[PDB]
Amino acid sequence: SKTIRSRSIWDDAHAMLEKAKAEGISTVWDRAAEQTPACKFGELGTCCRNCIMGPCRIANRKDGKMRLGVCGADADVIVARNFGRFIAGGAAGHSDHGRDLIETLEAVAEGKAPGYTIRDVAKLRRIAAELGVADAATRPAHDVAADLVTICYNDFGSRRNALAFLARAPQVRRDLWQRLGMTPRGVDREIAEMMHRTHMGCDNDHTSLLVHAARTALADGWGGSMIGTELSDILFGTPRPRQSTVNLGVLRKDAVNILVHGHNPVVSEMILAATREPAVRQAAQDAGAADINVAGLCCTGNELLMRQGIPMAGNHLMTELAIVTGAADAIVADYQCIMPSLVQIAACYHTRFVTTSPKGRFTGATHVEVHPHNAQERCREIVMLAIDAYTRRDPARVDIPSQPVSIMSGFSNEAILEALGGTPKPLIDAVVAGQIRGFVGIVGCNNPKIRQDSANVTLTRELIRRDIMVLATGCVTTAAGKAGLLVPEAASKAGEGLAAVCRSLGVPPVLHMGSCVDNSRILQLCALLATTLGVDISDLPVGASSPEWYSEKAAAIAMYAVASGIPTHLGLPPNILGSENVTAMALHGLQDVVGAAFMVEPDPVKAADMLEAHIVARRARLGLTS
Amino acid sequence: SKTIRSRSIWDDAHAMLEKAKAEGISTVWDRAAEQTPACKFGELGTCCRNCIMGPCRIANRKDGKMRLGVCGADADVIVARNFGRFIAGGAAGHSDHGRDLIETLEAVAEGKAPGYTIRDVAKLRRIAAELGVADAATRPAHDVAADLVTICYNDFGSRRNALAFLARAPQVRRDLWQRLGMTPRGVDREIAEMMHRTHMGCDNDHTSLLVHAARTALADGWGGSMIGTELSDILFGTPRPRQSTVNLGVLRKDAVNILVHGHNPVVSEMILAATREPAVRQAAQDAGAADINVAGLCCTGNELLMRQGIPMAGNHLMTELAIVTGAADAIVADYQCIMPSLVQIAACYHTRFVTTSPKGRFTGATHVEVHPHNAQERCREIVMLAIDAYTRRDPARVDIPSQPVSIMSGFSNEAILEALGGTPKPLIDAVVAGQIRGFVGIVGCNNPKIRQDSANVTLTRELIRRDIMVLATGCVTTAAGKAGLLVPEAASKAGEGLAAVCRSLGVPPVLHMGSCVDNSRILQLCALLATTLGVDISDLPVGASSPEWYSEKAAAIAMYAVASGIPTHLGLPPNILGSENVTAMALHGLQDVVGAAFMVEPDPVKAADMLEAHIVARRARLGLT
Ligand code: SF4
């Protein structure tokens, strides 16, 4: 079918799209078609519903009518406020997840989280020492953890002048943020202040609103996300390189298949633990299954891949299709990017849809709420639900369409530095000599507007062919993995210089660096390189790209990349083109301010050209050859 | 003009609307007409733009298409998420205000706020003791202030199980909130969690979303707003009853007129002090003026009225009209509800539009940023700018249309208890006897959809005639004031029982209790009576009403009133009627959960009937007549 082929580049998606159509199951692509054409005011950002003097919409009329909202706000203010609330929603998604990790570490330090422990005490002591805990190297581990918990909680308070992890950024960058009024002060505070600013009759200057949007995004990348990443490593282990597999073929007909979906590994790590208990495996054996098979979706999947090597079934637009295989016996959901259509599609099969978070409630789901104090008991109950659902699987509707594709994962900054012999000096030498011309983090989602992973893969291929190493996170991980680019043998697909460095280190030309919160690892790496070299992040030959983004979280990531000095490409524009001034700020004005700007470009080859041009300009300023 | 008469009940509004028309100046009412009819999806709440798989809209179509968003979210989820973010924006408006008051008190405690002081040390010691500061009664006042600052800041952190001021609520209400999962834990935390819940693919259950909306609003009423009110009293004085005046006639042709607008008394109080310095006054007199005349707009005007008796020029929809008098020489703005049209209308005259907050930036305004460490010199500078603007006033364009109307203000709970002899017992006895049948807080804004103050005044008049005492805050203050209802002689407009009680105490039948953050005083009063009686707030003969609301802040107030057990009337629906399930929860379902619900009724006489009906039912449950 020409329509099905246009929706994705992948055979396993095509196969499930055919099956979904045969079984009369509507998908995200069908709902996207029903919502096309979309309201122009919504697309442009020129609609405001922030009070009930509205709704207001701004037209561009020669007679000057509908130029202002009822309160007098113009298109610049309305677009900038909508964009600011958009960013705040993304920052809040990461913020609340980082907050849950603080609470989990506190429960471990108090001895009130059965089955949880401090899996990386060495990293605990290092992070705590970095952030100022006294005698972190020698004091009892749970005392050090309690002091680290206090520091992280204080970043979720209202008394700091700068977040704790901001000290990683080079001095020149912290000085610039301070001069601009961009320094993030409190993770929750910046979000709340954004909501205040965007109330009627508060902030009515688009420049001020966009500056606070940058501050709010920075409070995510250097706060909520960075806390989430570093505490997740302490609690569940620091990733090291390991082999795994990707695509819908990681599901197994002869096993109980449990898909974990969402973002929080506090649940997924304990689901995986329950599946390895002897009594639970005997229950699955008694039900007729040969094994219990956990596979990942989206950022929870990314996390379990990085730390445990658990195979990833799919990214964002694969999620519905994973149920359409007929082999998903349970989906275990926590929060964020979990499409509620999955509840309805699961009900078309035997699949249990289990929610675990008080924040991730879905009408019609089976709710088994999980907290650290009860996770071990509750996750056992959830796996037994999956085994029970397995006994009702209709064997005639099972169609697992592909063989899995080998990948390598687990490239934390700790693993990267270890692969380099302990210092970044071999990486700096490679960049100075021009073997690696630069690095681009390719991050972000799928979006039904773009043929799934078409831009993600094309951009990745173009960059590695030009000797630009790619750092992959989020739903790009699955795209690079299915493309065969996440293995060391993929050096044959890179340019001569990048292939040579990859082969000498034994690593792929694309490094999987984790989930969306793990984009904080990319900030940390950039900050380490700039600090080592004595330059700003805006002087490094780096870039970031989200070719197929959709979420507020992805927009917040892009904003904190830009605000930190990383040129950032987006495949689709945010809803801001209704204001030329806001658009010009985002694409050009920010360059004058933070040393980076957004680029919007749906042609991935042209996106590669633009990212490469920035890298080459920055190499020249460093006195390097290109 | 019949169109002009249709826009306001007030003579000063009519006169300035005529003047605006003659001069070609467009107002909020003109822009409201341009935006009519509005998008039906926006009115119903059935539009979602929370990701760029959207925009999505939910329709009711024969083919069954557009029943769901691209992510699969239905109308119940989309409407409830939109309402949740709406409430979060209102809570955030109050929370950042409260946070600013903490920062100011901390600057005073550190000795780094020239011209600021602890005006009410007795209330500082009482509040600090209440919230757990050790030896608050005897320690040095600035040490006590630093420890109270720490307690308030911790409510803006992430480690509490319940906000500090929640202890005021009766135990039965705190137990209910705990069981429901509504207990507010952190002022910023609940706002941030709401923004997380409304991201695509997080909270997709409309009941869950509305319960967290209640928790977010409670974190305002018992957190951001209550902190804002109590610290404002500590820094600037606890209000006591005093006489003042209201309407555009408080402006004076022979004076430099400075209008303070927005919410923060931290700025308006120091502007007032600057205008009283002899050298500043002499500068005005050298410019030809007889004096400097400060008048208030909206909530910062409410604050200056409550504590300093400063006349109030007008409420929300009067703000543009104050400039059209041609006599406003400066507007000094901080944040919230300040319409950006004021900058362009000020540019039609000589008026200086001055912004003072890093959060309240207005393109084209004169920005003179004020912080506690520089407020004394910056406010002096601002007043000098107003005097310079006065020398540019075109006397031919001046038209101050009315004589000002007398009012009484200053009814903090401290002033109410003092007027009662020091205990709520006389008030309880009057309620028991049936002299005062109940109380309604009438709060909230104006809205161009409703003839300005027509419902605010009619509802007020209806309730006091039925022996229901009215507690007025926000822009209802100006409405009740201009109607002559805020003076003791207004007992003559009340029913026999309320008139008798009012005359015995020498108070009006409508008590001005302050700004929008000061709706926390109504919570405090309800919790005091309920705790004294040993019942829930949902057992008290009380109600709340915003007949002409517009703002997210007003919706959050209405939500925390409802979630606290106070039946709450709204003249206009929030943008939720596209979900029958969300609408039914708001109007009916909440009754079975928190003991109160929203009521939507644009006829203010029918609104009075409904509020009275709840009061009578609660009187019967107390075994009263
Ligand atoms: S974006 Fe605005 S104008 Fe468009 S459908 Fe939604 S509410 Fe209506």
Ligand code: SF4
């Ligand atoms: S805030 Fe202003 S532009 Fe937005 S809905 Fe209200 S009146 Fe219209």
Ligand code: SF4
């Ligand atoms: S969150 Fe769902 S309903 Fe809202 S815009 Fe995104 S896809 Fe549409």
